Amino acid sequence: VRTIKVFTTVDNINLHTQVVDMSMTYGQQFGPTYLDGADVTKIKPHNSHEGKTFYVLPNDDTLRVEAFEYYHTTDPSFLGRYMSALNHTKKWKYPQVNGLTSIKWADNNSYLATALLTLQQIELKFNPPALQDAYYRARAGEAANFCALILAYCNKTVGELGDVRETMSYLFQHANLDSCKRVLNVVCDTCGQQQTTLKGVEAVMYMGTLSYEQFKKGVDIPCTCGRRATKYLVQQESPFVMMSAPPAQYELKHGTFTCASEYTGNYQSGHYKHITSKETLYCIDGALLTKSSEYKGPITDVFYKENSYTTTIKPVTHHHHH
Numbered sequence: 001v002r003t004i005k006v007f008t009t010v011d012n013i014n015l016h017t018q019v020v021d022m023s024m025t026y027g028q029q030f031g032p033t034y035l036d037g038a039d040v041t042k043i044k045p046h047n048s049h050e051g052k053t054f055y056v057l058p059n060d061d062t063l064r065v066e067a068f069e070y071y072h073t074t075d076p077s078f079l080g081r082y083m084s085a086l087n088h089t090k091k092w093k094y095p096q097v098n099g100l101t102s103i104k105w106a107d108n109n110s111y112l113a114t115a116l117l118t119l120q121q122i123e124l125k126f127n128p129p130a131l132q133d134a135y136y137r138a139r140a141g142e143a144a145n146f147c148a149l150i151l152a153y154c155n156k157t158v159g160e161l162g163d164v165r166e167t168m169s170y171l172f173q174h175a176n177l178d179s180c181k182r183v184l185n186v187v188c189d190t191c192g193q194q195q196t197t198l199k200g201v202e203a204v205m206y207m208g209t210l211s212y213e214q215f216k217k218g219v220d221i222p223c224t225c226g227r228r229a230t231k232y233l234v235q236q237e238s239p240f241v242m243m244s245a246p247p248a249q250y251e252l253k254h255g256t257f258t259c260a261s262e263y264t265g266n267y268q269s270g271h272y273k274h275i276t277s278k279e280t281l282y283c284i285d286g287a288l289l290t291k292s293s294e295y296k297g298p299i300t301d302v303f304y305k306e307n308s309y310t311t312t313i314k315p316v317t318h319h320h321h322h
């Protein structure tokens with residue numbers, strides 16, 4: 001019997017010494033097994049494998065705890081999905097574009113590029129150590145592990161079409177937003193008013209208008225007493241807000257927003273671009289960069305800086321002048 005020593009892991013930090021029989025596959029001994037993303041389940045150990053680290057699934061109590069502590073998931077397919085994605089994302093390129101880590105287009109990944117660019121411009125701290133560690137590396141230019149984690153957390157495979165709003169939602173669900181608070185009021189014709197308080201992810205996301213200013217002034221909505229009704233922002237406490245809507249032609253004005261995403265083309269037949277407001281408006285499209293003084297396009301998501309906002313207008317005034 002010929003053997004080699006290898007290490008198994010679920011978090012690539014805590015290692016577990018193993019002695020493997022070179023006459024059996026990794027799968028026969030460990031279950032599903034990966035070497036830096038590559039599936040070696042059906043491969044028998046090589047001499048060159050000695051001392052190397054292999055990912056396995058969290059198939060015993062120790063690994064189950066290590067994987068939960070690192071990733072904050074007990075989804076049994078998570079490690080396989082992460083490794084499957086990493087085998088691709090490690091071959092992607094991550095150019096620095098206008099000082100930010102982007103992603104060269106591959107595998108329908110434009111939604112990931114604009115999400116990654118956005119993260120580098122808003123204040124957001126991740127909760128799972130896995131995302132903390134990988135995002136730090138991404139900021140330094142080595143974003144393969146971070147991108148593979150995004151795929152795994154969002155349950156998207158490489159090549160699958162993704163939505164930026166949904167992707168940000170998943171990332172925010174794995175981020176510390178406990179201090180974020182939103183208070184809204186709805187004026188329902190002359191039938192009454194209703195205030196609502198939102199926290200965390202729900203305090204920083206809105207679907208229906210791209211304009212933060214319009215949300216402060218008021219948006220028209222239905223209520224039980226008709227379509228003469230107005231919803232507006234009373235109070236906001238957060239370091240950013242994200243305003244989203246179905247793609248529509250929209251003008252982005254320098255200095256009035258932080259960054260945005262555009263979706264050109266048709267449904268499930270299109271492409272995302274990133275627009276960032278710096279000294280001028282830069283459009284980052286993967287590895288590509290252009291500039292303009294004004295930008296108009298089919299915008300889907302706009303990000304704004306915030307700290308603390310409180311309205312200085314009474315309900316009836318928003319209802320009648322928004």
Ligand SMILES: [Cl-]
Pocket residue numbers: 124125126131132135
């Ligand atoms: Cl972080």
Ligand SMILES: [Cl-]
Pocket residue numbers: 072127128173174175
């Ligand atoms: Cl989390």
Ligand code: NA
Pocket residue numbers: 119120121122123124
């Ligand atoms: Na950030």
Ligand code: NA
Pocket residue numbers: 099100101138139140141
């Ligand atoms: Na950086």
Ligand code: NA
Pocket residue numbers: 127172173174175176177178200
């Ligand atoms: Na959270």
